[PDB]
Design a protein around this nucleic acid. Structure first.
Ligand SMILES: Nc1ncnc2c1ncn2[C@@H]1O[C@H](COP(=O)(O)OP(=O)(O)O)[C@@H](O)[C@H]1O
Ligand SMILES: Nc1ncnc2c1ncn2[C@@H]1O[C@H](COP(=O)(O)OP(=O)(O)O)[C@@H](O)[C@H]1O
Ligand SMILES: Nc1ncnc2c1ncn2[C@@H]1O[C@H](COP(=O)(O)OP(=O)(O)O)[C@@H](O)[C@H]1O
Ligand code: ALF
Ligand code: ALF
Ligand code: ALF
Ligand SMILES: [Mg+2]
Ligand SMILES: [Mg+2]
Ligand SMILES: [Mg+2]
Ligand SMILES: [Zn+2]
Ligand SMILES: [Zn+2]
Ligand SMILES: [Zn+2]
Lengths: 366, 343, 364, 213, 366, 214
DNA sequence: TTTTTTCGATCGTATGTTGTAACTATCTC
DNA sequence: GAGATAGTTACAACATACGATCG
């Protein structure tokens, strides 16, 4: 294998491929990415036995077909360290690889390409295409609510449901729920899948705001995403996910409207003197008035008062300030509507302008 | 490689300074004295920089290698000290030490501290690499036989007068712990400026801090000294020794004695000792044991030992020490009415 | 309020310390002659005066008049050290601060000269709780100590320290305070406090102290509370009976002399508090075995049973071996049969009755 | 409706059944003014260690003053009854056995009480603390601030280090006899307006060993 | 104690005073800031028994004299979280401090002010005022060469020397040395002191690049620095610093001049594959040629060649790339001058046109 | 797919259980009178219906109609509990969750209100396998639980539990089933399943059962 | 001239390495 | 001068080694 390629055309694909690779692979072959040259294309592949990323680069210089495996970190560092506009000529000699470019020479070690693991083929049950912006908004509306390391293995991922003319993203961890829905413009059969958190993070990093539509294929237990010259493949959790419709409160009778910025600032100020372990605060709602109180083990008390639009009966409730702050940060809207029924029932949060996304938070018996 | 004792270390240092010094033994006091003497001589020679590291699985050998490789602008003549693990070096430690010995410089003075090395540990690449340019000082705690001479000499070099009774009391109270004995001598010198140490004077400022091992207990049992055996057992219990180790150490000698007693009916004892590979020094004590225990005995002892082992293993009982005391008294010529043997 | 006796009566002078002559005399001679070591270690049982002696030595080192074994107690340094506000005395609770990061900052202060004292004294107490990295840092600091810093260490478990640390410090071991000295100290304290007392109460409190002065002071405070401002023999005896937890030896003594009423009373007293009957039987078996071993050889009894040494010696001297063996066998059979008895208490009572009055019949 | 064990927790020293010596000692100490800073309570299960500890806290923090007969009607007494008193810090040692929690607790002992005259730490099931946790309390327990009191309760006292034991006043509660249990049951049932017979109460008292719970 | 202030006038001094505090202090009181109101002035003090920071603020509203101690991080967070332009009213009630801002109330616990340690007064020996730029230049030049954790305490600090009309900063760790010197325009007596690491860090932080002159007072065992309304006091390390003059080579026969950026890039590329454990590189210098080589135990080698202005005999010398990279980063200039004699002697690095700063590096055994 | 007789014929109503009359009567009286405790323990031999009775009690507590001793069996809560997927009924297998960390994590979430039902029921099975630290951690909250939580414990070796735990809960002992009851239950099951049988075979099976219906 | 130990399951403390989030300084429009 | 990008610091999670208790 021998090929000459411009540094700029090879910078971004190397970073994209090295992204999924972890610091500790536990296998020498896993730590090395697969580099192939064929016909007039250069393919870089990176896998960790659970995810796969493939990038393609066009070649205009004479070359010979071949395949090999090279360390991701060392190769990426060498390529990035060279001056801008340099041309990297990579050749294979025996077990070594010459990366001669200008006056600099390197001899990277290589391993057999046959040892590189591969993923079995699968049948795509559903296929569609959506703009990058819609996917980014859908993922951002519910990423923060995903459970980190919950014992339930199926709660560590996000639920994607294609239904009718819309696509829905659901995230939950057992105490808070986030739901978002966006139209796609094409009718698809009803289907539901679960994607692990690492796959969601990789998909988010993949998006760059380009005009190229992103194509999604979903099989029995696999998902593939195509954008530009980048392809990503991941497995599915294939688990039992709770229905979001049950969690949502039914015909709530108390409504409250508030400003997002003032409410967020009040909650942030109140959270300073709250319990570090539980992060519990108390909300008192009265006629056109909202009061927030927080206490800590040192008996330091924080109190905040603000004016809101409310006309129901007086009520007292408890909450975890962290979830409320996360929801307020996620909304990024001008006004926020809160729907409540009683001190022992869940509370729903939505944007006043639009109802595309909704959040549900359960109370605590302080 | 030169071999020396602590007393000759100063003479060797006066003769010259070598590249590496190995301090192997089980006596903290002698090891500390040798280390201090070596470091003082090195500082006199112009070694004003010292580094110390502890050898363990979580060890940063990169720092040591960088120290060996790097130079110094002004503070040259470095000294490095290593503390080996109690168990001893393993294959990884062996190769690390070989690499370190490879990167050795005239301006670097190496010192190693640890327990005595076995034949397997001795037969190592790093150990042989230093054979031509090393001196090993053996620091072993003297036995009870040679202890009083050491105490008398140490008192003499401090300009103190010790009576025979005071020397015996000091040896009894601080057997196997020379650091405590030296500190006791220093405290006695502080208390009495005149330096006259009589029995009543020493008896006031002495406490029992002896140290023993299971082999001492087994030897006491073989000799037949009930008081010494009980004292050693109590000290071992206070230290926190594992009963199973004592059980195995006693079992080996007890089975050997049983076999010798059975087969000595029609065979001289010397031939049996030669066939069983008995060390020459021990052949004395073993002999008298065979003249003190009958065949009726050495069976009750075996039964009691087996019962104690079963209780320790399956019942997880806490009365192991009481049974050990009973067995110790049984080995000595005592009635031991056998209600406690369950025989 | 009246404060607490333990806190109020801290020894503020070498003359106030009770006993421990072999340590105080050596320290005084060393201070007088100028022979001062770099590191001191203090060991002993609880409440014997390790911290008090360490503080007294620290006060003596940094007195305005000079390095003396009899601090004046009136200069500013003495008052500040007594009140715990002296800048050059750094007291480190190793139990509370064990991680290497916490110890590093404290040990890095040795690079600054003393502010208003001849020496910079570090008093590290509970030092046996430090981690390996903290021990390594302390050893590195002690290898090359500045001439104007001293280290004082106090602990009850010296065996936990590395041998390297031990070999670089001078160790003093404190002894138990004995009954007579404890009684004298209690009498002096009560006379100073204007509290009525009787000799028998003081003797009982001193005997129950078991070589610890802090235990004696705590028991004295509890007795004063129980006696309503007075210390009396009856009140102290009742208080000690409430805390008494040696029913096994009393039961053995009552059984050996064939006194059924005392045995029943002891059983009722044991049942009054929450006790495990099988544990009681095990304790009685252990006591009988120890008595038999002592009968075989006087050296069997060690220093671990110093509290009840006299009673065990008397039982060994008086009771014939055959009775001890019979009682041991009866208790073994009782322990074996305990699980199937109608009740644990009933099983223990039946076994004690059999030991008192009955004798098993053996085969052949 | 409400469980009898929770409903009938003693709220005054007169409601405690038995334990005469402990109550007398505490009353004498409170009246004379000789108050220690470390109390340990021992005994079998369900004898009233926590109840007596809470009564002592009420007596110490009562608004009227330091008295052996708490009023039971002021704000402090009611809040202690409801478990909402700020200055009564109740620690469940069985749950927080780690040294980090102990260090966090010790780092805030010098701050003055919010409303009461004393800050009372009531550590329950203290025998479950780790060795490091036990050793971390030695100095603070020996010499606490003026406005700090420590109350300890356990059913397995022998597991505590001797150093901890030497620093506190020990009170051993004793198991209740049949007569006291039967009398208490009679009183409770009479207050509850429930029919009963003497033989049933005697059987219940004998079947309960020496625990009221 | 009662006072009222503005958020802007208090935000920055509070941050400066509370910056040093962190972690778990030796005593709880050391974790708090001392606030004193007196004669229309608010003084904020923070200490850790090694160095002290004092800030002053002017009060133009009704106030009451007093003193107290408050938590640092809590108070700073409360002040920062309030809306911009708000008025903060602080009052002391019993053992509590009440902070009011609009409709927001906070209650904080305090400790007696009598327990706060106070450093004793001392008499200065040398006093001089210099611009902040000179001190910043000296510190940024000579900071990176200080040792991190060594048994020899005096090597952990920085040596400040006043000689004639010149101020010099020197740092070293036994393997490398950095020296810088600047004029001050005024004559001072010869003197030398050692500043600890934390003192240097705080002195660097307190500088803001403004036109306010920095006033420095040096005494027997303490150093004080005045900048505007900020006062910083620190203690000095005791010991003897090695003489740097003997370290400099007496007569370096061989000289070289090289582009700074090109040399830095070449060193970085060589170090990308240098042995991570040792970080060693080998330089071959010949007529108008400099070659840098590195290798790792896996038999992988990296080589680079560049041109220089050299006229001496051919030579080979080993080095630790970390020190060279640090020196090159410190020197921001178009060209760098290297002076050397042999492969077992120290090498001097300086700027081509500036002689103020010099660096000495000891070669590694290779 | 196919379910064995033991799984298929699990009782779903208080009237479908065999024997244990005293326990059922006590539970019914307690529910009717409104005197509801917060800690129930069930002890007995193997295969006597401890888990069945615990599940029936849990179903009765959270029934939509109300707290009754005769659950309807048709509302959403009853069906979900029968299917074993009810949010507010948390079943813990103490034989595999012995770690104290799991117990602490479980106790940290008791402050949250129930999702749908009026009570949050915890059903701990094989509780005798928990470690000592787990029992000690439980003690405090088990003594005084919040008003919206209940604890149900089932064990076959109550001797291993500490006395402190036993003192805090109401204990129900289940007797071993008699031969006649087992024979009648087997005959009823076989008749419902349409399987030919003979009296002597049923007698032999009941005798070999040795008081265990499983 | 040597002779050194029972096993499984659970809990607690301290250190090192890798990854992610928030805030600040620097670069580009 | 503001927004965007890159660099630094602090906190959390995972992995490894060592010590202690009860059955
Ligand atoms: N030798 C002694 N003389 C007088 N009082 C003593 C002595 N030893 C202990 N005490 C008393 O015991 C109390 C606690 O002693 P302490 O300093 O804790 O010793 P340790 O550090 O050994 O526990 C002190 O207040 C003191 O009054
Ligand atoms: N001495 C007593 N007098 C009255 N009631 C008691 C007594 N001891 C226990 N009880 C009852 O037992 C219940 C539990 O007691 P508890 O506080 O748990 O004691 P412990 O802490 O010793 O377990 C209480 O609610 C109370 O009603
Ligand atoms: N009292 C009972 N009435 C009817 N069936 C029973 C009874 N007890 C046990 N069974 C049968 O035994 C099977 C297992 O019972 P299970 O709930 O495991 O009891 P345990 O928890 O005591 O083992 C059930 O499926 C059920 O069919
Ligand atoms: F403070 Al101690 F023994 F309890 F020295
Ligand atoms: F609460 Al308890 F013994 F059960 F003190
Ligand atoms: F005997 Al089971 F659940 F099977 F109690
Ligand atoms: Mg002490
Ligand atoms: Mg309780
Ligand atoms: Mg079951
Ligand atoms: Zn003085
Ligand atoms: Zn009151
Ligand atoms: Zn229903």
């Amino acid at each position: 294998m021998k090929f000459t390629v411009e540094r700029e055309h090879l910078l971004k694909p190397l970073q994209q491929v090295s992204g999924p690779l972890g610091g500790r692979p536990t296998l020498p072959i896993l730590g090395n990415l697969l580099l192939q040259v064929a016909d007039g294309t250069l393919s870089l592949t990176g896998t960790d036995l659970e995810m796969e990323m493939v990038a393609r680069v066009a070649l205009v210089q004479p070359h010979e077909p071949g395949a090999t495996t090279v360390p991701a970190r060392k190769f990426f560092d060498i390529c990035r360290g060279l001056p801008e506009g340099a041309e990297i000529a990579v050749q294979l000699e025996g077990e070594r690889m010459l990366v001669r470019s200008g006056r600099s020479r390197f001899s990277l070690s290589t391993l057999p390409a046959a040892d590189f693991p591969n993923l079995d083929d699968w049948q795509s049950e559903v296929e569609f295409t959506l703009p990058q912006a819609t996917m980014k908004r859908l993922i951002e509306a519910t990423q923060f609510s995903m459970a980190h390391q919950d014992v339930r293995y199926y709660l560590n991922g996000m639920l994607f449901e294609t239904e009718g003319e819309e696509l829905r993203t659901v995230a939950t961890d057992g105490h808070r729920l986030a739901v978002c829905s966006m139209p796609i413009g094409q009718s698809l059969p009803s289907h539901s899948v679960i994607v692990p958190r690492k796959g969601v993070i990789e998909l988010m990093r993949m998006l760059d705001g380009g005009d190229n539509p992103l194509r999604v294929q979903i099989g029995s237990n696999n998902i593939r995403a195509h954008v530009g010259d980048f392809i990503f493949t991941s497995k599915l959790v294939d688990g039992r996910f709770p229905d979001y419709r049950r969690v949502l409160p039914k015909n709530p009778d108390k409504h409250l409207e508030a400003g997002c910025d003032l409410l967020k600032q009040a909650f942030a100020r109140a959270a300073i003197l709250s319990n570090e372990k539980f992060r519990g605060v108390r909300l008192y709602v009265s006629e056109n008035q909202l009061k927030i109180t927080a206490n800590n083990p040192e008996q330091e008390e924080a109190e905040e008062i603000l004016d809101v639009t409310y006309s129901g009966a007086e009520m007292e409730i408890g909450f975890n300030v962290s979830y409320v702050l996360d929801v307020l940060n996620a909304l990024k809207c001008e006004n926020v509507r809160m729907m409540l029924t009683d001190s022992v029932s869940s509370v729903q949060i939505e944007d006043a302008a639009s109802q595309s996304a909704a959040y549900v938070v359960m109370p605590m018996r302080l | 490689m030169i071999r020396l004792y602590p007393e000759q270390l100063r003479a060797q240092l006066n003769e010259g300074l070598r590249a590496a010094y190995l301090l192997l033994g089980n006596d903290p006091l002698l090891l500390q004295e040798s280390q201090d003497a070596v470091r003082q001589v090195a500082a006199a020679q112009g070694f004003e920089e010292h580094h110390t590291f502890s050898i363990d699985p979580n060890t940063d050998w990169n720092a040591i290698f960088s120290l060996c490789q790097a130079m110094s602008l002004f503070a040259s003549r470095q000294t490095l000290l290593l503390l080996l693990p109690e168990n001893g070096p393993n294959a990884a430690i062996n190769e690390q030490l070989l690499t370190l010995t490879g990167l050795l410089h005239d301006d670097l003075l190496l010192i190693v501290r640890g327990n005595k090395l076995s034949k397997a540990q001795e037969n190592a690449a790093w150990f042989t690499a230093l054979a031509n340019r090393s001196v090993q000082v053996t620091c072993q705690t003297p036995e009870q036989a040679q202890l009083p001479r050491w105490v008398a000499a140490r008192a003499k070099q401090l300009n103190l007068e010790l009576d025979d009774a005071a020397n015996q009391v000091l040896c009894y109270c601080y057997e196997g712990n020379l650091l405590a004995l030296a500190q006791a001598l220093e405290r006695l010198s502080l208390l009495w400026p005149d330096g006259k140490l009589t029995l009543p004077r020493v008896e006031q400022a002495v406490n029992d801090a002896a140290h023993f091992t299971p082999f001492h207990w087994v030897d006491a049992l073989l000799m037949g000294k009930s008081k010494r055996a009980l004292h050693i057992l109590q000290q071992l219990r206070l230290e926190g020794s594992e009963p199973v180790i004592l059980l195995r150490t006693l079992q080996r000698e007890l089975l050997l004695l049983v076999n010798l007693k059975r087969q000595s009916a029609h065979t001289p004892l010397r031939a049996l000792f030669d066939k069983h590979r008995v060390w020459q020094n021990r052949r004395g004590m073993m002999g008298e044991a065979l003249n003190r225990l009958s065949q009726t005995q050495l069976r009750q002892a075996v039964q009691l030992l087996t019962r104690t082992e079963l209780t320790l293993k399956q019942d997880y009982g806490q009365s192991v020490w009481a049974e050990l005391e009973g067995l110790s008294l049984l080995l000595c010529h005592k009635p031991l009415a056998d209600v406690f043997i369950d025989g | 309020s009246y404060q607490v006796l333990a806190r109020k009566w801290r020894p503020q002078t070498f003359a106030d310390v009770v006993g421990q002559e072999h340590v105080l005399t050596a320290l005084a001679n060393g201070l007088s002659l100028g022979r001062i070591h770099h590191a001191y270690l203090f060991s002993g049982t609880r409440g014997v005066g390790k911290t008090s002696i360490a503080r007294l030595l620290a006060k003596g080192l940094n007195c305005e008049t000079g390095i003396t074994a009899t601090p004046c107690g009136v200069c500013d340094n003495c008052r500040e050290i007594e009140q715990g506000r002296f800048v050059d005395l750094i007291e480190i609770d190793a139990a509370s601060r064990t991680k290497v990061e916490d110890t590093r900052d404290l040990l890095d202060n040795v690079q600054y000269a003393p502010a208003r004292g001849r020496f910079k004294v570090y008093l590290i107490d509970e030092v046996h709780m430090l981690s390996r990295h903290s021990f390594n840092a302390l050893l590195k600091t002690l290898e090359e100590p500045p001439e104007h810093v001293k280290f004082l260490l106090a602990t009850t478990d010296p065996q936990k320290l590395p041998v390297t640390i031990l070999s670089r410090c001078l160790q003093f071991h404190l002894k138990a305070l004995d009954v007579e000295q404890i009684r004298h100290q209690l009498e002096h304290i009560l006379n100073e406090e204007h509290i009525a007392h009787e000799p028998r109460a003081l003797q009982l409190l001193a005997r129950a102290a078991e070589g610890s002065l802090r235990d004696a002071l705590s028991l004295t405070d509890q007795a004063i509370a129980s006696g309503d401002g007075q210390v009396s023999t009856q009140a102290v005896s009742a208080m000690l009976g409430t805390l008494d937890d040696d029913q096994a030896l009393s039961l053995v003594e009552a059984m050996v002399e064939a006194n059924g009423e005392r045995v029943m009373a002891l059983i009722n007293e044991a049942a009054a508090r929450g006790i495990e009957w099988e544990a009681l039987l095990v304790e009685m078996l252990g006591l009988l075995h120890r008595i038999a071993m002592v009968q075989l050889s006087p050296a069997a009894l060690g220093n671990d049973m110093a509290a009840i040494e006299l009673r065990m010696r008397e039982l060994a001297r008086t009771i014939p071996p055959t009775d001890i063996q019979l009682y041991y066998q009866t208790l073994l059979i009782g322990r074996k049969e305990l699980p199937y008895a109608p009740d644990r208490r009933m099983g223990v009572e039946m076994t004690l009755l059999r030991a008192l009055a009955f004798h098993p019949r053996m085969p052949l």
